[PDB]
Design a protein around this nucleic acid. Structure first.
Ligand code: NH4
Ligand code: NH4
Lengths: 104, 110, 105, 110
DNA sequence: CATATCATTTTACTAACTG
DNA sequence: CAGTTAGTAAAATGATATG
């Protein structure tokens, strides 16, 4: 499956890649951790996903989630101050607030 | 579920956001506490909701333990975000010994 | 002894009175508590005076009685709580008279 | 007495105030913690002052008990009030594991 | 006494630094 | 990068102000 995020990125969680519409010939290569976080977020779009859920989907020391979110925001060129993709929900987890569409 | 408050704010408790028709481009970012207070008030529009009911819905139901005064501080922050005058409220009225009351018009979208 | 506060008020702690130069014919009459608070602040100009000192100069050896008297005094001085010109609050330490203070006579 | 910092701010630690010569009418009001940090930094200008020294001067000597994190939060607020860039500081420099350092020019008035 | 606002402290999440 | 240290945002709480 692929996802369209905020009318901008095509995300393929199986190949761990992002493609920016504005730079269609450049493959953005996600680390496995960041790809799995974005996939779980996209599977439950606009839902707040607990740090526990995100954590358990990647690993079996909760600082690793925070760093993986920072890297993902960088690859998405998302602002921490003013997020357009991944929003932090203090004491609750993270929330994918971009428009999310599935293709194929 | 979305709410329209006083014919002015679009409230989304699932995103903790307020959009003011004056500046439809600027999102207003609500903290979870203020959003959950506004949500309970909007679910019971124009009813006086006890401090106890608000404390349980906002904090206890989330597994959070806080003193009573957290509600007062959060009400104060919420009024500031709504630019509601404490002396002459258009949105959130205090009823001493009884709680708080959303007196703005409330409509549900979905 | 009289004090001149911020080039504006003449303060007589002995008669518990304030006179505003902009309204020189009106006597502002202070309650004894507020007058003693102002007097002690004026005796230690621009010093932070502890809540304990202010309280003890007025009342017997609550606490909100000091807070209420400061509020009353700021109203008589037409002082802004948000932007003080006369009596400034020093959180966890007390209050501080920041107006220029002069003794006359 | 007072301090002139970086040829820009007049700092009075007895009044917890900053005056920016660019807006000589606008007093910048410092909290007591931020003012006591700046005061100790200015007493030892361009020296690296340990977190312990700062913690003792700002809180312990005043009779206040706080965690170490209070100093970091207070430094952050102080830099905001000075409009100091954390990435490229003009006023307060962090020296990891050693403390903080006032690198602005410091003069004593009177 | 109850509530409101401001300040301080602490916690939650984020970024920088060094073997 | 790994864990330690520091920075910023948010929450909780304490202090002071008002009704
Ligand atoms: N006492
Ligand atoms: N502080």
């Amino acid at each position: 499956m692929k996802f369209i995020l905020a009318e901008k990125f095509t995300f393929d969680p199986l190949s761990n890649t992002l493609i920016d519409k504005e730079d269609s010939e450049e493959i953005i290569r996600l680390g496995s951790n960041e790809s799995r976080i974005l996939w779980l977020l996209a599977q439950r779009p606009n839902e707040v996903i607990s740090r526990n859920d995100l954590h358990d989907f990647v690993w079996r020391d909760d600082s690793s989630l925070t760093q993986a979110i920072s890297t993902l925001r960088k690859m998405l060129k998302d602002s921490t101050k003013s997020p357009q993709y991944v929003k932090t929900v203090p004491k609750r987890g993270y929330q994918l607030i971009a428009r999310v569409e599935t293709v194929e």
